[PDB]
Amino acid sequence: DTRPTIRPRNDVVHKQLSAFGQYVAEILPKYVQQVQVSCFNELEIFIHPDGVIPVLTFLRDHTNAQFKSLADLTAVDVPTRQNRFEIVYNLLSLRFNSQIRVKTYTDELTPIESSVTVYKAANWYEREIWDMFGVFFANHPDLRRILTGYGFEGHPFRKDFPLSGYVELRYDDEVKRVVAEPVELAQEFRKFDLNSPWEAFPAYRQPPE
């Protein structure tokens, strides 16, 4: 084939995903702000934060969507935006053999309606989002830290949280108990600025401001 290295691209899936994207957009124009199909046939739906519950319920219950499995629930921390956190939902439809992406936005101080009602799988995913990033979710049953140690300060996955953290641990013999101290690395993490100053992909050349 003329493209033995380039990954083949499917247009039929692109058309089916695009048609469904318009379908969902017309169904709930109250929350669906923009929708796009990526080059590698993946659909993303951009909803308003208030539409977290209604949009998910429609995708879960509609006969023409039947997205009945929350694959994962994560957020991407982008400090340059007004709402730095960007909650992302990934759903899979077993009946129609397709996956969808539903993404919202949220600043530091704003609660999001927990999707525990629609997807009981979200319950533990919600705690991770709050623990790693700090996004609080209202109506969550048992919202608490899930991964970080007890009495942990801050939210690690935030881009403004240092990788090495603020506190290390040590067994102090004077108190005969493991204690916490300010971090002091034997060798500091050698940061590597390895971004070439030459443009990589002209396709994503952001127009000048």
Binding site: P29, Q33, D61, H62, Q66, V78, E86, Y105
Partner: protein, 115 residues
């Protein structure tokens, strides 16, 4: 109309010995609730189109197995199960009611993710 299947395979999904009437009554309840939806909503026309095909579809075929094959919805017990979900979806859709225009246009650069 097809012998009564011993089990649906799926755990918890009990076999419905009288599935034809169950589909007919639920589908009528679907168009019932869709009545409270004004015409302008895209939800009304699409769901009515889906259910109207399905309603005239279940009444035409008396056999269960031809119904399941032609419905393209797996076992029949899933069809009542999903039609029930469509009922609950339409009911709670009446509360939120997304026909209204977008509640708020997002900030200028909330999307657009090249950093």
């Amino acid at each position: 109309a097809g012998l009564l299947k011993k089990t649906t395979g799926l755990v918890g999904l009990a076999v419905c010995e009288t599935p034809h009437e169950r589909l007919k009554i639920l589908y009528t309840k679907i168009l019932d609730v869709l009545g409270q939806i004004p015409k302008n909503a895209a939800y009304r026309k699409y769901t009515e189109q889906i259910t109207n095909e399905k309603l005239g579809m279940v009444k035409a075929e008396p056999d269960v197995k031809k119904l399941e094959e032609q419905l393209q919805g797996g076992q029949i017990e899933e069809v009542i199960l999903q039609a029930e979900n469509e009922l609950s979806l339409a009911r709670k859709m009446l509360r939120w009611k997304p026909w209204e225009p977008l509640v708020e246009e997002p900030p200028a650069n909330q999307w657009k993710w090249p950093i």
